[PDB]
Amino acid sequence: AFKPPPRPDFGTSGRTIKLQANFFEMDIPKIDIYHYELDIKPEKCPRRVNREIVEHMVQHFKTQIFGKPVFDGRKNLYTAMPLPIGRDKVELEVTLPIFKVSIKWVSCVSLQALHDALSGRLPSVPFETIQALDVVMRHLPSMRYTPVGRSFFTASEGCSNPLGGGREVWFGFHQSVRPSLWKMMLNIDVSATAFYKAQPVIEFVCEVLDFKSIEEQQKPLTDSQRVKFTKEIKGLKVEITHCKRKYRVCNVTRRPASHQTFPLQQESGQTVECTVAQYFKDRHKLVLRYPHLPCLQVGQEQKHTYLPLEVCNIVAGQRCIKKLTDNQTSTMIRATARSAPDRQEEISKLMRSADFNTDPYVREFGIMVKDEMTDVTGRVLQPPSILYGGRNKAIATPVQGVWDMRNKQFHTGIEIKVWAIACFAPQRQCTEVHLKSFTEQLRKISRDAGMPIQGQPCFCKYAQGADSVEPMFRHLKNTYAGLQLVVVILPGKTPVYAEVKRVGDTVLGMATQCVQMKNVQRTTPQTLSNLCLKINVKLGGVNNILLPQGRPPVFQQPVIFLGADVTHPPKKPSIAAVVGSMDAHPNRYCATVRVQQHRQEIIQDLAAMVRELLIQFYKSTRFKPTRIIFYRAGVSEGQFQQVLHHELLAIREACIKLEKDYQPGITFIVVQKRHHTRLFCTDKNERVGKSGNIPAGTTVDTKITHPTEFDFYLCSHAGIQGTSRPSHYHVLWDDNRFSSDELQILTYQLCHTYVRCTRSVSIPAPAYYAHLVAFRARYHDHQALAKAVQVHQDTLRTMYFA
RNA sequence: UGGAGUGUGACAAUGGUGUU
């Protein structure tokens, strides 16, 4: 439970398809770079200030040192060539129109060891080296661009994309230095956001208040305009233009600049009441061109510092946080999240205009970055045959990641004979005609799906308030003998849903299915179809199974599939969910959910959860799992060592305390949807759909993947919009000794066992289910709430989370 | 609350050190 497994082989299954990744090949020298620690007092200075201080320290001490370093911004310094120092601390003083800086030697970072690491020599890739290189590549844009999080943003070169108000669209990019199979690469992905337009505040008022010009009004119209302008400018930073000095707007004055008064404190004689306009007229010899406009209150309310709008400009680099209107959000998504070729060309254009090969800090260390994206081979895996049943027992073949139930019926359809209707929406907007039409349409779709509605509901009543849920359900449960389903019509977002699911899933164990109000009014066959999928699954039926004869050889012996995900509160306990397959299809899953420490992603009581699932598996199959496939979802790389250490033991421990010396092979895999890796089709004809993304099933385990460890990219879903995010899978452990092809095919095949739709999903079904279970337990003093997530006895043996 | 896909969030929340 310490070391991750090496990649066994390279996959050879599927049709090859020429690809390009958003990785840019880097040429890195064998030179050793030198690392030094800085010590700066005071110890609270912002990063930008630190970079500024170091910048001053470099040029003013060229006679002693620096015969061109890079900076972290906080206690990390690198130089290409060495300097006159030692392990001893060298302290000096600098001045900024007053700081004390101490430079201390730390260590040497050899890039020869980096080549030995990228090659087959050293198995471990020095993290300190990756950090150093990343600091080098980020040093310039950290000062040149506007840093946000881990990305860098900037304005537009020619055109200027507006948003209205004081906003406009600034574009940016996220860079990160990553290790590869043979050569270091630079990962880069573009993005966009909304910044405040760098303009005079007098024009900001014009744009916020919908003025063609400021001379449209000679006097302030209303208190509401004051509130609106304040709502937009309160909190923003502005620079002055009659001396430079940056200020922060705390409020907007009620009175015009001609009447806005303040304590003048004219040297001696203390304060005299003076208006802002008279002040700027006397002191700064400036007559206000627009004295009828209010002032910006800046700084402290006790300080009484006001500024006319015509001397203030909004400083650039200020991102917006305010709510975006329809046109703003539209123009945003109408200029970002574009199709795959558009994003591809944007990244290329970015790599062309960023020009890393001409920047001094990059050239200092002799680093060369390829201006073209990295070509990668890639290969499209083969979609599994989906077996439907019914009278004909037809087969569905996933075309482009999507199939349908046209002339097909469920593998195990359920004859629904007893069911109820409880509408919580007002009868005024939801007539009985809507309910009957919805009933007819539902019955037809149901019977067509192989899950026939054998007749009208035994119950149909309107209701209101969540307090009506628990009593009614009890009555419903006691009146009608052997009811199968309770359909709950909701008028939108309401606390009713949470109680419906609480009473339904935990308290009584009744199969409940909520439907939004509008879908009851106007009904399409597709919606009713997916709804039937959910119903048929919730009632214990089987929608569809993988073709039994068309499965990887792992199924030749009893094997269980586990999925795990963790959800954190908005102080409240977090909840971890672990699901497990309960048959050999594998279609049916049982859910286990626990409560945990705040924001602790490491599943603590995992062992017991696995124990339950294992026990339930034996109860449902009469077979003991010779293999355990654990899909962990939600953890990032920085948590791997931690998670893999505990949870794997937690799994293994569960296998020991159960029976004798029963130790099946555990295959610990980490699913990751959140990453800055994009894949594009090289051939224009290979593009799929409007979004023009890579075809569903695209598999990559070369060039852009880890040099030594077992990981692979799999785009298992078809891109509906924008650019697809290929799900990344990292095998942290593997006792079963999977081949690349086998595990990739198994994973892609498990992406077809999703029971809520006739499509291929981005992540495997167990992980998705685990996410649904977790998010469901969200709707449901610590030991008290620990039993709140404990679902019902009869609900446990079902997929209520579906 | 029919479903899937992908954009935004990072002046985010907390515990920590520290400031007139």
Next chain:
RNA sequence: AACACCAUUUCAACACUCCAA
């Protein structure tokens, strides 16, 4: 009570697109 900074938390929220010929 405001304000800085260091280490963590991709959790959740909102929105959009797609499911006529």
